[PDB]
């Protein structure tokens, strides 16, 4: 779901205020800026040497992670640059001393550094309001597959 071109749209895609000097003769790829969101969260190497831009990247973009940390399961990865996470829980009705299965749908914004798909459990973190509905940035794909790590069977 990611275009091969590093910028595909009409506007140029740059990380704002990080400048690579062409008059200099180092001729490295670029000057890519990055940061670690803390909380003992490892910045992915795909972000460390990646070439995407993703203004709202917790690792490369301007957005900062602070506040709630929610673990959920991916229910929809098929809307661009964003994720829809199903969070399940049990509401305790006290008149019966019984619990009640319930679910909420938390939108979030998964960076291109992560490769997500329907069913991956995901650790996500709070941030600024990014869109009308997304307020969380995907911080870790704990279960990349879960039960698809071993696929074939050749004895």
């Amino acid at each position: 779901s990611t275009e091969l071109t590093v910028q595909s749209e009409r506007a140029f895609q740059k990380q704002p205020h990080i400048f690579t000097n062409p008059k200099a003769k180092a001729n490295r790829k670029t000057k890519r800026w990055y940061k670690n969101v803390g909380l003992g969260f490892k910045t992915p190497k795909t972000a460390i040497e990646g070439s995407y831009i993703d203004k709202k990247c917790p690792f490369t973009g301007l957005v900062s992670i602070r506040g709630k940390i929610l673990t959920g399961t991916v229910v929809s990865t098929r809307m661009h640059r964003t994720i829809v996470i199903r969070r399940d829980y049990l509401h305790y009705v006290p008149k019966y001393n019984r619990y009640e299965k319930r679910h909420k749908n938390v939108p979030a914004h998964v960076s291109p550094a992560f490769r997500v798909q329907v069913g991956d459990i995901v650790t996500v973190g709070q941030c600024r309001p990014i869109s009308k509905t997304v307020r969380f940035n995907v911080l870790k794909v704990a279960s990349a597959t879960g039960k698809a790590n071993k696929q074939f069977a050749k004895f």
């Binding site: 049990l90 008149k95 019984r98 299965k101």
Partner: protein
């Protein structure tokens, strides 16, 4: 064991089952539908004034032979017309035609009481004064 589920995660169906069964009662159905406001002569009202249209007496049932002295009153709050009961012995003459009368409930939850058919309201006050004060000659009708 029993009809209801018992699992620790069955709060939802227990609650909705109780919520669907609650409509079997009459008090709950009346309270939630709010039929009192829409259909009853008074909308959740203990008392209501009205104007006497005419002056009727209604026969009793089989086991009781008499004619209970009623009065047809058109309610002023909304315009409905209901029969009402003039309670005591010599109080029929006390209430004259086309005077304001304050009807009250008949004490049987809006249902006909005793042997009087098709009546559901007493008479407590007439022309601003109470019937009980007139019946013991403590006060007199203003006659306005």
């Amino acid at each position: 064991g029993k009809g209801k589920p018992r699992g620790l995660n069955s709060a939802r169906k227990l609650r909705v089952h109780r919520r669907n069964n609650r409509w079997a009662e009459t008090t709950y159905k009346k309270r939630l539908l709010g039929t009192a406001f829409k259909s009853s002569p008074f909308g959740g009202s203990s008392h209501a004034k009205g104007i006497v249209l005419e002056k009727i007496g209604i026969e009793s049932k089989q086991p009781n032979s008499a004619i209970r002295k009623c009065v047809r009153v058109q309610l002023i709050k909304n315009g409905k017309k209901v029969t009402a009961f003039v309670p005591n012995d010599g109080c029929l003459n006390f209430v004259d035609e086309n005077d304001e009368v304050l009807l009250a409930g008949f004490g049987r939850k809006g249902k006909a009481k005793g042997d009087i058919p098709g009546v559901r309201f007493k008479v407590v006050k007439v022309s601003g004064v109470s019937l009980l004060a007139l019946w013991k000659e403590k006060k007199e009708k203003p006659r306005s």
